[PDB]
Design a protein around this ligand. Structure first.
Ligand SMILES: NC(=O)c1ccc[n+]([C@@H]2O[C@H](COP(=O)([O-])OP(=O)(O)OC[C@H]3O[C@@H](n4cnc5c(N)ncnc54)[C@H](O)[C@@H]3O)[C@@H](O)[C@H]2O)c1
Ligand SMILES: NC(=O)c1ccc[n+]([C@@H]2O[C@H](COP(=O)([O-])OP(=O)(O)OC[C@H]3O[C@@H](n4cnc5c(N)ncnc54)[C@H](O)[C@@H]3O)[C@@H](O)[C@H]2O)c1
Ligand SMILES: NC(=O)c1ccc[n+]([C@@H]2O[C@H](COP(=O)([O-])OP(=O)(O)OC[C@H]3O[C@@H](n4cnc5c(N)ncnc54)[C@H](O)[C@@H]3O)[C@@H](O)[C@H]2O)c1
Lengths: 257, 257, 257, 257
């Protein structure tokens, strides 16, 4: 029941970080994966290590024409389409009173609009092929608890979750499932950037900010991309066949719902 | 104690519906109100009825320069500034697969960006004047439960709530409180449009749709703007002095948190 | 609309702390208050200072016969019954692996059973008289987030919240509202004592424990009973007429729902 | 990462319904399972069919002496102990004003106390043997939303979730995870019973009550035990290694968190 053999997957933002771990895990579980990413060279590198082969395609998830074209190219390459993991996201950090319109839009356009477009287009394909498709979106701990210095980011990730819920309600009568995962403090390049921004803004060392994240975590350690990826495999699989519209926390006990 | 005597309030989207009720209720409680709205003449008519006088100013909450200018004009007119109720909002209704970018941006730019802008600018003012300012944002039941045919609207209202939480956390050390309210099925012009849109989309009469809303409401009646307004007064007031970052449900029992 | 003039209230556990503050606030707002408490001398001490008179009655909220008789005596004394504030509660702090059955039962029977009996009997009274009755139960932050060292306490307070929601659903069609309040870190005369015990269990000093509670509170201070009581006034009043089944956080930003 | 090969499990309430499906699914995934149930005849019948051996033991989860003896007997039979699924539960349906003390106690003693005892004793064992132990408790949709006619049942299931969260926070530093699953409208004998009671209390047919549950489920069918059991497998597994303190909805989209 956890097997993804034969399934055809697209992972947006799959070149690096959590997305790459998702792609690797989906593949380990039996799927054939297309990675759509701003960095198509990094996508090809990930594909090189997948067991079932795969495909790399360039996409800018902020732009409808790009997402439409990327998705169609991936679907054509895969020879079908069963699963979307919409993972592309960004952050900037800033005191709320100083957030710029530019970075409000950067966060919204990638995190919320990028999920919208990939999801909307995915569902169009699923419906046109009468597929029991499955969507997993990457939200955040900040889709559950507003985070200081990330107020715009939090807003954008709450938007993901709300979109997820509503979409799920529309797609469930069509046997299309839509869920999201809410990671905690994940060791990737987004975290390494964040610790340095945060330390500066709070006047702390990077090391102390890190240690605070671990102190907040009941399981006692910083999170890895794989911690999230293995949960996305679950939500993609038929073990989760009676689950839709959820924001599954994968945070080590930080956030309980 | 629920008195707002001597407090200086700005209500965005106060010309009509919930915002007009909020303006009347704040004024009944002792505040002097400035209404900032697209519809300046309707705002002026609400102001005409208020006990403590007040001011009406044109604003388009989607635009930073407009919000900056309208807030400054209001604060100048009021002679101070203690309370922002950011209420302006819009909706469209569409199957998720058919949502346009135009209507995605219309919902986000008013609902989410407009709150952002009014709040951020309010907080700059409060901090510059050393005022223990208070914010009440109007979210929605759709900030708690994703609603079908309103997937983009829901996402935008989730974003309000996430923004509210994160700002509350930043503002709390400054003794500035930020909360939102989440109304249910409130009988305003927006309800009248939605009833019609939903009737159109589901092949029902608008009256049957409205009756279904009441059937879904434990307290057994359609909601009034005043149902909401009296809770905004509470949240504005010092009775709510130890409450910040909440999404207070005012739905007649439809949603419980 | 926030006035309780003419209303007749019963407060269980009104002798001390949050309950005493509730009784004093209800009275200030216009109500006539009966306090039902295990310590009737301490109840009478609170009644002595109230503006609108009132009545003190012995009760053991763990026993149905006691609650029925106290409630009946109180209603008789008041000449009516509009409002129940079910506040009686207890806690013991213990590592989860060392919780005794006695401590489990103590917590459940007072906190969860006590609310059940008082609420059930109140509702029987309201329904028999066709009264638009209101209930405010005192839950806890630990009804929202389970708390280490308070695992049985948390379970009991989650139960209060679930009870509140279900009862509210049943009662709403009969024009009876049922809400709860979820206080945070409240300074009562008992907390000197429960802080030393926590400090002992955690290998900290009492000072360090109290300071940590402040640190953890966005609004920057320990909570007072009055912070809660004023929100209870609101929930009792017709300002909250369109709210039912809620767990209203009064935590200074610690918990956001 | 989803394999439970070699692991030793105890399922309380595993004789029929959801519990039996849990016990089957854990076994299919590679575990050896002991079932502890009030009906040991039925438990033995399930155990007889398991691939990996197993053990049936009689338990009354409402009694500490019973739980301690049954768990020790199981652990001795299994030769180790890695996993507890505390599933035993009961319900009765009754209007909230008519709930008896006897049925309040029945619901609490099984549902909440029985999880407390099983979990507490399990953790004692895990800690003594330095075991990375895992607990999955069976809560309910009614741990998330209070259910009319089930107010006592809801309160007991809220308790299970709150216990789960608090215990998770205490156990997380010791490498022990504690989660719960919240099933929706699952077709078992609890449902066949309830459909009848509810139909009588509401003046409806049993068929119509069941139809109403389907109507309320976005995925559009009544839930099966296996829908729940497969998620339990996931939570038991190392795929869920960075998840603790959660109430995972398995409701077909009825409740989203
Ligand atoms: N690191 C964390 O703690 C954390 C926590 C919660 C959520 N998340 C979320 O997880 C997801 C991935 O985070 P990460 O930490 O792995 O970050 P990352 O910066 O490691 O990776 C981001 C990926 O998204 C792609 N991307 C960015 N903008 C894009 C665009 N416009 N079009 C297409 N692809 C684009 C990048 O090229 C990259 O492969 C994001 O949604 C992020 O918000 C991260
Ligand atoms: N009616 C409901 O059931 C309902 C439910 C939940 C939330 N809401 C929310 O409550 C708020 C008020 O809604 P309502 O039902 O009273 O709607 P309404 O249409 O009666 O009033 C909307 C007000 O917002 C103003 N407005 C719209 N866009 C604006 C802009 N760009 N700049 C300035 N002013 C603008 C309008 O001119 C109008 O005065 C909105 O945020 C809405 O999303 C309404
Ligand atoms: N719709 C549903 O059926 C539904 C929904 C949500 C939750 N649940 C929960 O799922 C769990 C199983 O429900 P089910 O529908 O499979 O019910 P069931 O009535 O079919 O099975 C109950 C099981 O628990 C056992 N049990 C009862 N009292 C016990 C005691 N004192 N000690 C030990 N064992 C005891 C029984 O012998 C039986 O094996 C329960 O916790 C129940 O509350 C069921």
């Amino acid at each position: 029941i956890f097997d993804l053999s034969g399934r055809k997957a697209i992972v947006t933002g799959g070149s690096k970080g959590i997305g790459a771990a998702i792609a690797r895990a989906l593949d380990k579980a039996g799927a054939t994966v297309a990675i759509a990413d701003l960095d198509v060279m990094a996508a090809q590198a990930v594909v090189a290590g997948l067991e079932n082969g795969g495909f790399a395609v360039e996409v800018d998830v902020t732009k409808r024409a790009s997402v439409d074209a990327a998705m169609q190219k991936a679907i054509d390459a895969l020879g079908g389409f069963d699963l979307l993991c919409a993972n592309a996201g960004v952050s900037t950090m800033r005191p709320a009173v100083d957030i710029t319109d530019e970075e409000w839009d950067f966060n919204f356009d990638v995190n919320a609009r990028g999920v919208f477009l990939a999801n909307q287009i995915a569902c169009r394909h699923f419906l046109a092929s009468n597929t029991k498709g499955v969507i997993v979106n990457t939200a955040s701990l900040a889709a559950k608890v507003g985070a200081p210095l990330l107020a715009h980011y939090s807003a954008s990730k709450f938007a993901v979750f709300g979109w997820t819920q509503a979409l799920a309600r529309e797609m469930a009568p069509k046997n299309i499932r839509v869920n999201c995962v809410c990671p905690g403090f994940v060791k990737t390049a987004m975290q390494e950037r964040e610790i340095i921004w945060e330390a500066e803004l709070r006047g702390m060392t990077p090391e102390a900010v890190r240690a605070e994240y671990v102190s907040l975590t009941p399981l006692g350690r910083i999170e890895e991309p794989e911690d999230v990826a293995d949960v996305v495999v679950f939500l993609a699989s038929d073990a989760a066949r009676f689950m839709t519209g959820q924001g599954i926390n994968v945070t080590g006990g930080v956030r309980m719902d």
